[PDB]
Curated annotation (Swiss-Prot):
Family: Belongs to the HPPK family.
Keywords recorded for this protein, A-Z: ATP-binding, Folate biosynthesis, Kinase, Nucleotide-binding, Transferase
Gene: folK
Phylogenetic placement of the source organism: Bacteria, Pseudomonadati, Pseudomonadota, Gammaproteobacteria, Enterobacterales
Pfam families registered for this protein in UniProt: HPPK
Subunit structure: Monomer.
Pathway membership: Cofactor biosynthesis; tetrahydrofolate biosynthesis; 2-amino-4-hydroxy-6-hydroxymethyl-7,8-dihydropteridine diphosphate from 7,8-dihydroneopterin triphosphate: step 4/4
Function text: Catalyzes the transfer of pyrophosphate from adenosine triphosphate (ATP) to 6-hydroxymethyl-7,8-dihydropterin, an enzymatic step in folate biosynthesis pathway.
Entry EC number(s): 2.7.6.3
The protein's name in its UniProt record: 2-amino-4-hydroxy-6-hydroxymethyldihydropteridine pyrophosphokinase
Molecular function via GO: 2-amino-4-hydroxy-6-hydroxymethyldihydropteridine diphosphokinase activity; ATP binding; kinase activity; magnesium ion binding
Catalytic reaction equation(s): 6-hydroxymethyl-7,8-dihydropterin + ATP = (7,8-dihydropterin-6-yl)methyl diphosphate + AMP + H(+)
Temperature and thermostability: Thermostable. Retains 75% of its activity after heating 30 minutes at 96 degrees Celsius.
GO biological process: folic acid biosynthetic process; tetrahydrofolate biosynthetic process
NCBIfam families for the chain: folK (TIGR01498), PRK10239.1 (NF007595)
Amino acid sequence: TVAYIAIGSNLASPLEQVNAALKALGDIPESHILTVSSFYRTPPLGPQDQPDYLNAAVALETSLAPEELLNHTQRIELQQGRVRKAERWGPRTLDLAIMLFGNEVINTERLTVPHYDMKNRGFMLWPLFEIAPELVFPDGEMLRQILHTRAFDKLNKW
Ligand SMILES: Nc1ncnc2c1ncn2[C@@H]1O[C@H](COP(=O)(O)CP(=O)(O)OP(=O)(O)O)[C@@H](O)[C@H]1O
Ligand SMILES: Nc1nc2c(c(=O)[nH]1)N=C(CO)CN2
Ligand SMILES: [Cl-]
Ligand SMILES: [Mg+2]
């Protein structure tokens, strides 16, 4: 199954964080990277007392169960010093979001796929569109037509 993973970092040298994340993603068992996007510098969504993000997307072929993939992405976050605090939408060294897991629809306590807010976020959709221009969501919507509808600001390279 092809999983699409969003990468974000705005602490502790985001370029190094994203490169480390890509290396680690490729080392996940029973999985391999298919495609990687460019790196983008994006202004923060949410609180404004935090640095700009590096955002990117990856396509990962995997035979892991989705929750097992999640276990691995969370391990990578922790390896790269991810902490969590009370604030929502706050800064982080590394975040990995499972945007899609094939065409699956998953609604569980630990895991919601497609990612619950991605259709509202240019910083998730644009890097995804770079690597999967033909992508269709489980609900039948085309990524290309969502981007044209919402007309989110285009991104700048990191
Ligand atoms: N599709 C998905 N990808 C990654 N984590 C997911 C997920 N669906 C649910 N989660 C849950 O997300 C929790 C961690 O949330 P956080 O990483 O703190 C929010 P965030 O990723 O910073 O912002 P966002 O969810 O608003 O994009 C995990 O414990 C995990 O169970
Ligand atoms: N530009 C940008 N802003 C964000 C990001 C992200 O990846 N990029 N993720 C967040 C999740 O809470 C908080 N805000
Ligand atoms: Cl959908
Ligand atoms: Mg997260």
